[PDB]
């Protein structure tokens, strides 16, 4: 059992695995590492096709919402593909889908279902396009909720990533973000 | 039951004093990862001049002080009732007698060396989780980013929120969650 | 011993080269949390053109390089004497022979892909812990954001501090503490 039940990830070098505008138009690298009562996370994203590859016209943001059921399992019609979202085995994922990941879900006491507009449910910081300090992008992570254009979409748990560069002209650049570290309180 | 997390609980009642007793809810979670502590912090004001922000208020400050065993001092500006080791989403019932493993390391962050760069963690957080409303957070370990706090303590953690130059009048003072780490005493 | 933390010690003597040998004190602590390393970094210059900042100086750079076993190369710009696994507030005296579990993952951060966004962590730190004195810190894993470091290594970690546009002349170069994490090789 080369398994590691304390890390849930996309793999460190994913194939296209998520939908920012269309199916598999980006590679999300997301690693969740369980440190008891807190999850330690790293996230980065790279667009591979469409209006973010390269950034065209008037687009100044990108959004991904990941939704899980009561067992911490991705919902049907997930915008993150489930095939390579699993517990760690070396640099790969287990092949058999997990049945329970509640230990990696954002705590519902800390981050209640209807509370996405609450300050505590948001982690907000700058990341940098192409790892370039002169090209800031704001990242807003929302736990068990959304601040955007209205979400009472059923899920038990959720994690929302919103990248925004209002005011910046990044036309003809590929949308790709520096790696960002964060933590949140675990459900169990 | 979990002796590797010391917290306020994830959903505290008013539990700290920014300008008067119990005028805010501090959510502070400390998770021991051996030689480093992994921490998350958020604050929400519930009454007074921060709820909502009034007049000329452009900052808020909290100092938490501990004794040599890592126990909150008397006259604490963080209420000790629900500051304890984790049990579910609650605290253990019996007050802890030792948390030295969660205290900021005195070799790394010496007592009253708060003006030293290394004893400070400084970053932007965001009012109401709103990217257009930045607030600077300065965290100081075993000191204050200022001349002497003269109340003795073995260890301390100081939080200073500042929004000089911004007009947030009539907004409730509430901060996005912020992750940091620091070197543990043992 | 504590084989889950690799560090400079929490209060190092001068131990790294920004512009000359031992012209700075780097505090760097790496704590293994399975698949991720939790890190804290701070730097303090002690002599030369950064102590205090003089003339035209608006940046500082350090590259740390390791072999296939995770051991510092010869001609290291971080001194190997006090870079080791934790023993109290000190280091083990006998040099480590393997630290591959602390190295940046090659699948995530491929060798010489320093211009790739994912291999960079970028944020503001603050001179003297002062919120009015920002400094950008760019961390690069297994590469350098300034291209083509030509010195071969199995693994590397690059730190670039930049304050273009700011006049910090006559200040000592000293940074607030900064937390980050990265995917571990094993
Ligand atoms: Mg910033």
Author numbering:
A (entry chain B): 394 to 581
B (entry chain C), C (entry chain A): 396 to 581
What does the paper say about this structure?
Here, we have sought to generate high-resolution crystallographic structures of the cellular interacting fiber-knob domains of species D adenoviruses HAdV-D26 and HAdV-D48. The fiber-knob is the receptor interacting domain of the fiber protein, one of three major capsid proteins along with the hexon and penton base, as shown schematically in Fig. 1a. We next calculated the amino acid variability at each position in the aligned adenoviral fiber-knob sequences, which revealed regions of broad conservation corresponding to β-strands which make up the main fold of the fiber-knob trimer.
The shorter HAdV-C5K DG loop does not clash with the CAR-D1 surface, whereas the extended HAdV-D26K DG loop forms a partial steric clash, with surface seen to clash with the aligned CAR-D1, and HAdV-D48K DG loop is seen to form an even larger steric clash. Our modelling studies indicate that the longer, inflexible DG loop of HAdV-D48K would be likely to sterically hinder the HAdV-D48K: CAR interaction at the β-interface to a greater extent than the more modest inhibition of the smaller and more labile loop of HAdV-D26K, which in turn would exhibit more inhibition of CAR binding than that of HAdV-C5K, where no steric inhibition is observed. SPR analysis indicates that HAdV-C5K binds strongly to CAR with a KD of 0.76 nM. While the KOff of the three fiber knob proteins are similar, the KOn is fastest for HAdV-C5K, with HAdV-D26K KOn being slower, and HAdV-D48K exhibiting the slowest KOn. The IC50 (the concentration of protein required to inhibit 50% of antibody binding) of HAdV-C5K is 7.0 ng/105 cells, while HAdV-D26K and HAdV-D48K demonstrate IC50 values 15.7 and 480 times higher at 0.110 μg/105 cells and 3.359 μg/105 cells, respectively, reflecting their reduced ability to engage CAR. While still low compared to the known CD46 interacting HAdV-B11K and HAdV-B35K binding energies, that for HAdV-C5K was higher than expected for a known non-CD46 interacting adenovirus. Inspection of the model shows that this is due to the close proximity of the large HAdV-C5 HI loop to CD46. The residues involved in the predicted interaction are not conserved in any known CD46 interface and suggesting these are random interactions. Furthermore, interaction between the DG loop and CD46 is integral to known CD46 binding interfaces and is prevented by the HAdV-C5K HI loop laying between them.
